[PDB]
């Protein structure tokens, strides 16, 4: 049938998950013979299944989660993304204003924003107090100075969950944007030129923090996101002391802390300035969620996806997954103080950019994701890093 969708989406939360039904059947509600067919996919699968199904649009999705930034765009030309520029509603364009840019390539809008998540430091307040560190570190030196203090007062410093890669690359990301010029650094990133020193420079900068060995000891076997074990896992149940991660962060712990409910002690802090960095100071960096269409699909799928955008339901998002809605007036729900301070720090950002493995699509993405957790292990070096990016970069 034609007024039947199918919904993919990257919920693996209760919380999270049980939102989705609840939007779908309330949307049943309001629209009368259509049914929405649900699947949850976990993160680390969803590119993939996408991607196959995608081959051939007419046996897929037809509504799914975005892989964001250069990947929306490899998805784009290949024709399995729908033109939803004059297909959003009044509402969305009013209130997604901010948020929308990460939707739009070539002046045309691909999807519905549901939430803006930038990146930084959060971390147990608490396990700060047990080791000393009294204030957060403004600065990086300052920073593996308090791993030090918490390695020494018997806890595991810093939480990585480089099994998954991409949380591993995070601490390089953070690093080449502190040290690279913006204009060295947007300028690399659009033209995948990476000769840059500052590139060199952030990779040594983080090995220097592998040399502290101060990660959570089975960080090379650790996941991010499934089981008490992986690294949100190992924050949330305060084994250890800090995680570098985005702003669905709140609401991943809320998922893996012993009783359900918020992390007690959870603070943030934003990533530290790095001395001799010529990067922007302040400068944020995230990713925001949408939703794209199938170009195959009929006016059901539009109605859903616009139907996201609606402030009550954007309210909810913001109280189920414990994040920033990406519609304006529904982040006066937004209680929680970290994210508070978020809101802070991103209402008075010149800019943001995109996860650098997003902006840089699925290719360098992977081969820099790869690499920064293969001189983790000891199997490469900072050159090595800037290597892989090249080489993979020849490929378009
Ligand atoms: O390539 C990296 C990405 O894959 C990464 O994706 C984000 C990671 O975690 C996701 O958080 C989910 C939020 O809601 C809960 O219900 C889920 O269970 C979590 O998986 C998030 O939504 C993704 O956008 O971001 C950064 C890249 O480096």
């Known amino acids: 049938d034609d007024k039947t969708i199918t919904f993919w989406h990257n919920a693996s939360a209760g919380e999270g998950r049980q939102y989705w039904e609840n939007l779908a059947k309330s949307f049943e509600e309001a629209n009368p013979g259509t049914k929405v067919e649900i699947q949850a996919i976990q993160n680390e699968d969803f590119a993939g299944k996408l991607q196959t199904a995608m081959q051939d649009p007419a046996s897929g999705p ?5 892989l964001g930034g250069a990947k929306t765009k490899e998805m784009i030309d290949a024709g399995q993304v729908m033109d939803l520029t004059d297909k959003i509603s009044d509402t969305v364009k009013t209130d997604m204003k901010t948020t929308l840019s990460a939707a739009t390539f070539d002046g045309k809008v691909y999807g519905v924003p549901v939430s803006v998540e930038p ?3 959060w971390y147990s307040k608490d396990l700060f107090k047990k080791a000393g560190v009294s204030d957060v570190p403004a600065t990086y030196e300052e920073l593996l100075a308090d791993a030090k203090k918490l390695k020494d007062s018997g806890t595991d410093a810093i939480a990585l969950g480089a ?3 991409w949380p591993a690359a995070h601490w390089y990301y953070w690093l080449v944007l502190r040290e690279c010029s913006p204009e060295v650094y947007d300028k690399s990133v659009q033209d995948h030129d990476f000769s840059n020193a500052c590139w060199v420079n952030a990779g040594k900068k983080l090995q220097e923090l592998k040399d502290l060995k101060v990660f959570n000891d089975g960080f090379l076997t650790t996941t991010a996101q499934q089981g008490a074990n992986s690294s949100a896992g190992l924050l949330a149940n305060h084994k250890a002391a800090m995680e570098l991660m985005g702003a669905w962060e709140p609401g991943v712990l809320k998922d893996l802390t012993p009783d359900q409910k918020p992390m007690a002690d959870l603070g943030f802090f934003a990533f530290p300035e790095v001395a001799g960095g010529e990067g922007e100071p302040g400068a944020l960096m995230g990713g925001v ?3 794209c269409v199938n170009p195959k699909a009929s006016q059901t799928s539009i109605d859903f996806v616009n139907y996201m955008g609606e402030k009550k339901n954007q309210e909810d998002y913001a109280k189920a997954f414990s994040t920033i809605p990406a519609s304006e007036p529904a982040r006066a729900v937004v209680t929680d103080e970290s994210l508070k301070q978020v809101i802070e720090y991103l209402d008075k950002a010149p800019s943001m950019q995109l996860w650098m493995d997003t902006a840089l699509g699925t290719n360098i993405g992977n081969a820099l994701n790869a690499a920064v ?3 983790l292990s000891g199997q490469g070096s900072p ?4 290597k892989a990016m090249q080489d993979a970069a020849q490929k378009g």
């Open 62 to 66: 037809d509504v799914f989660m975005s």
């Open 119 to 121: 990146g930084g430091m």
């Open 163 to 165: 099994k998954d890669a």
């Open 289 to 291: 969620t949408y939703f």
């Open 373 to 375: 957790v293969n001189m």
């Open 383 to 386: 050159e090595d890093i800037v």
